[PDB]
Design a protein around this ligand. Sequence first.
Ligand SMILES: O=NC(=O)c1cccc(NC(=O)c2ccccc2)c1
Ligand SMILES: [K+]
Ligand SMILES: [K+]
Ligand SMILES: [Zn+2]
Length: 398
Amino acid sequence: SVGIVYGDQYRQLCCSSPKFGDRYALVMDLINAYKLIPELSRVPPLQWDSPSRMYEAVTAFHSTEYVDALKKLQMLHCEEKELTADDELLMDSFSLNYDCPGFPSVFDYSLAAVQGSLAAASALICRHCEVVINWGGGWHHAKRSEASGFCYLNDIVLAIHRLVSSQTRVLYVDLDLHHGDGVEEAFWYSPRVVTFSVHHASPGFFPGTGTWNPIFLNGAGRGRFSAFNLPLEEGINDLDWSNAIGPILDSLNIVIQPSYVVVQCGADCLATDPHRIFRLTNFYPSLSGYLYAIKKILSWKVPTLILGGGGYNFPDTARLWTRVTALTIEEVKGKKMTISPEIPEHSYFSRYGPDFELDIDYFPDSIQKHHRRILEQLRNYADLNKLIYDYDQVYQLY
Ligand SMILES: O=NC(=O)c1cccc(NC(=O)c2ccccc2)c1
Ligand SMILES: [K+]
Ligand SMILES: [K+]
Ligand SMILES: [Zn+2]
């Protein structure tokens, strides 16, 4: 079956941040308005038997002092008076500031995404679901002891950690506009989690990594060659983006043969995202790069975790993720999902004005070098990890 993470409290928590507002509610209500929920198995967010069990789950990746600091930040923001200078300095030392501010629910909000993605991972492990979707998750920037890019807790690293420790290999695929640095870094020394991020990179653009460093770094120790990156120039469309990553996806699957796939599907590559950097769509006839990638990944028939991420045009993120959700049901259950080109009436209908259609409102050799580089890296990866692959069969894809 296809699972999806939601619950009433979950919804409230995912909608309590100053940066992403009610986006999750738009997403889940658009999915509901298109009658997709009856097709889906609800996956309840994980809860724990005690504070100690919660901490040992979260400190599987994050340091105890960082988790303490985040929890204290929440408490401090549930009080009237300003932070002391000592508290400011403490928060600064974990980058809990600037673009990662405190707010009254910052800990519960962050933890919620972890609860969802851990429950999603468990539903895959026990084989209750073939695919699980968590649109409240996908926070790929958070580090062991540092908030970054409005990511406070890295639900992806924790979910992946549960998957590998269940021999097991995980392929992580990061489609967000931004480099998934936090996930990449977490598994930098681990060959069993192969990470692949496609993203914009350019001087001064956040977070700075996932590109020429001059050479391409790609893992260390036994994890050498296990971190893959494809940095792309601004302005790329659905077709060029698809052609850029399609051969890479297929070759990674063939060579790695992952036991699980985890996909971060941040929607900030949409042409209508305020970043205005890539020109991807949610079109399903030209064809959305997102839907192309997901369809390709689901065709592998590997247990899969699909996560959200970036996406700052909320109704258009809803439009895309509603389509990813329908496509997942169709590919997994083999049952056609017809989605009306018009937005159905529902609680958030007015947010989709003024045209109220499902399509986003938009009218549409460097890469060849990157493919050779990535092919060579995949070869070094296989060599280092003694994996058997048809070098030709892989080379033909490109
Ligand atoms: O995956 N990471 C992100 O999505 C991310 C991280 C940092 C900054 C930003 N940028 C913004 O928050 C933003 C919001 C509105 C308009 C322009 C940029 C995005
Ligand atoms: K990415
Ligand atoms: K790795
Ligand atoms: Zn992003």
